[PDB]
Ligand binder design. Structure first.
Ligand SMILES: [Mg+2]
Ligand SMILES: [Mg+2]
Lengths: 71, 136, 171, 175, 37
RNA sequence: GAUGUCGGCUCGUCGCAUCCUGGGGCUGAAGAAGGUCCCAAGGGUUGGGCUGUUCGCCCAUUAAAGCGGCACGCGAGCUG
RNA sequence: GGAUGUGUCGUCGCAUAGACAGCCAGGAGGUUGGCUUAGAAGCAGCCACCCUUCAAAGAGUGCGUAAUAGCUCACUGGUC
């Protein structure tokens, strides 16, 4: 999971402090190719049950969230 | 710790706490239950203990201060004059007085941090919180 | 709390005065207790009532009831402890009424049991202690356990058949 | 809130679950003998910002607010209460608890939220129309961010008794 | 046996059971054995 | 109008906060050798070199070569 | 300084819609969270404590290994 974000955004290690100087930003369509290769291991239902779990790994790593719900 | 300048020497006497609230500054506090002479190094022990426990923040309020000179026994004597200023500095602490108060740390993060500090003190103590509104 | 007592067939509780006597098919086993607390058969089963509810009365309550159940289950079917020897060369035999162990010590250990208690050995690396009173069987087996306590490095010694032992292990 | 007698001889209440108190406005300055347990249970809910209907011996219901409490040192238990007899249309200056809402984009960064004034003095609100709390947003704050008097929302027709540039909530750095 | 004049709770396994008017501690781990004399 | 003062010798006895020996618990206790704490005062606790020395250092052994009290125990007992 | 010693009064909760304890049984997918390193995976230290499935499982408490695994708890039903 760590390598898929590191290759797409262009990260080497991660982040020493995930609260101060951030890392980068990614788009929502990129989440489709991560969950499709990691679908047999997933216990989740369909569509909404896999799109929300992947985004959480970008939190502690330092990669900023794009868009989200409402408006 | 020690004061900057003054008079040099003093005296000694006791009766119940004068100017020591409960709240103000912090959320939780530590209160003396017995009358004592709190040494400079005694406070410096408590500061360091609580300081370590919180790691980063320094949200500790030291309400007491060693504004008092104490003297000592050069080696034996009595035949001769008044004694050495430079033994220690003290804060006269009467029951009720708040010595220390903490900010931002949790209930337990304070119960324990004060428990450790108590063990470095020459007197019985107790932990306190809110509802102290005389003047603000 | 402690309240219900199951009393099958050959039970005969003659709890007169301070001697709370219990006669049955597996010999006569007597057991003494406090008179300050009440005890008698209420038709089919038994009950041990307590007067006060402070603490000194509460403590003797649960104790008095378990001990009567122990004396009841005693004269009913009986008590039997299963012990297991472990370690190279360790073995036990029978010399009449006495148990004889050969467990690593320069001389062989012999244990003559007290009254009502009986020793038995199926395979020479297994000991069986059976008798009337739970305490006497408890002690006798503990004395046999004392002969060699299982060690923290190899568990060699006298253990409780299906007994679990933690192993330190140095070298 | 209920109470009995009122003399200057307090041995009849000393050992008992009672606190000697008073209520004043500019007419009746009535002395008390209220229940310690009841006053404690209730005062902790209402504080100074709140008031309660106090019925004396028999039936004389009066609305009153808590002015000052003089508690015993050594044992933090209160010993004397001062009540202020509420009018109808206009009250006094009331110290209001300054609380916080939401996380700060500075608190998570390295520092922490420090409420300098725990209670705030406010001019002419109106009695029975007094703010029981004082919610203040902190989210906008970083490190070196102060919030003064002229930055706090006052609930309908209320004014600040304290100075315009008096620091209320400041977010402080680490160590 | 670590004879400490101030026996306190270390982990959720220690059972404080008194003996002949003295504070004694019985626990699963052998190092945890605390007494006052 | 006097309670002889250091050390030694002689003679003992007593406390235990135990040096040995006895019993235990934990151990970073495999065994052997230890460490450490608890219980324990019955007996034991070497001979020399240097120094008035107590002390201490060394030699050679030991199960061990304990620390203290007794007017820094003991001069109507000796030394000096 | 310490402690389920008994006596009496208070504060906070959880409960016959069945709790505390106890036995059967589950143990989280992501993920060997990122950093930090010769390795640091729930468990040497810096930042957070987000998500999915539901009857439930906390980037998780203490032990174990050199890092793993093991074996449990915080939480979830039955029997009571
Ligand atoms: Mg002289
Ligand atoms: Mg020994």
């Amino acid at each position: 999971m760590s390598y898929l974000i590191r290759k797409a955004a262009g990260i080497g290690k991660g982040s020493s402090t995930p609260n101060k100087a951030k890392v980068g930003k990614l788009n929502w369509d990129q989440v489709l190719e991560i969950a499709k290769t990691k679908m047999p291991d997933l216990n989740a239902g369909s569509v909404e049950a896999a799109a929300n779990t992947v985004a959480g790994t970008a939190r502690s790593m330092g990669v900023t969230v794009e868009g989200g719900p409402n408006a | 710790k020690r004061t900057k300048f003054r008079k040099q020497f003093r005296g000694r006497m006791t009766g119940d706490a004068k100017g020591g609230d409960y709240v103000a500054f912090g959320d939780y506090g530590l209160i003396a239950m017995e009358p004592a002479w709190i040494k400079s190094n005694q406070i410096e022990a408590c500061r360091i203990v609580m300081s370590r426990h919180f790691r980063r923040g320094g949200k500790i309020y030291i309400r007491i201060f060693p504004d008092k000179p104490v003297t000592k026994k050069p080696a034996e004597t009595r035949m001769g004059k008044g004694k050495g200023a430079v033994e220690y500095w003290v804060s006269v602490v009467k029951p009720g007085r708040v010595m220390f108060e903490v900010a931002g740390v949790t209930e337990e993060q304070a119960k324990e941090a004060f428990r450790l500090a108590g063990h470095k003190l020459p007197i019985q103590t107790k932990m306190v919180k809110r509802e102290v509104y005389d003047e603000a | 709390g402690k309240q219900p007592i199951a009393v099958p067939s050959g039970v005969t509780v003659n709890a007169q005065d301070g001697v709370f006597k219990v006669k049955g098919p597996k010999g006569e086993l007597t057991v003494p207790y406090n008179t300050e607390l009440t005890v008698r058969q209420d038709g089919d089963q038994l009950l041990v009532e307590r007067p006060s509810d402070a603490q000194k009365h509460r403590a003797l309550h649960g104790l008095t009831r378990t001990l009567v159940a122990n004396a009841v289950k005693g004269v009913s079917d009986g008590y039997t402890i299963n012990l297991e020897l472990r370690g190279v060369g360790f073995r036990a035999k029978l010399t009449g009424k006495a148990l004889e162990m050969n467990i690593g010590y320069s001389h062989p250990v012999i244990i003559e049991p007290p009254a009502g208690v009986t020793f038995a050995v199926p395979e020479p690396t297994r000991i069986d202690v059976s008798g009337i009173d739970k305490q006497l069987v408890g002690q006798v087996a503990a004395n046999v356990r004392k002969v060699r306590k299982p060690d923290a490095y190899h568990g060699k010694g006298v253990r409780f058949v299906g007994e679990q032992i933690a192993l330190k292990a140095g070298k | 809130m209920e109470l009995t007698a009122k003399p200057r001889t307090p041995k009849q209440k000393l050992d008992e679950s009672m606190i000697a108190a008073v209520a004043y406005n500019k007419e009746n300055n009535v002395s008390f003998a209220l229940d310690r347990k009841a006053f404690d249970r209730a005062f902790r809910q209402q504080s100074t910002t709140g008031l309660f209907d106090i019925t004396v011996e028999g039936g004389e219901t009066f609305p009153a607010l808590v002015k000052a409490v003089q508690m015993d040192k050594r044992k933090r238990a209160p010993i004397h209460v001062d009540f202020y007899m509420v009018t109808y249309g206009e009250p006094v200056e009331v110290s209001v608890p300054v609380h916080t809402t939401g996380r700060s984009q500075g608190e998570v960064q390295g520092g922490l939220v420090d409420i300098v004034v725990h209670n705030l003095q406010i001019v002419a609100p109106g009695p029975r129309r007094i703010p029981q709390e004082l919610v203040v947003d902190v989210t906008k704050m970083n490190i070196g961010d102060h919030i003064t008097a002229g930055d706090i929302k006052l609930p309908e027709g209320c004014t600040l008794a304290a100075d315009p540039e008096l620091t209320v909530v400041s977010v402080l750095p680490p160590r | 046996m670590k004879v400490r004049s101030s026996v306190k709770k270390m982990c959720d396994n220690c059972k404080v059971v008194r003996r002949h008017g003295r504070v004694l501690v019985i626990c699963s781990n052998v190092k945890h054995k605390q007494r006052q004399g």
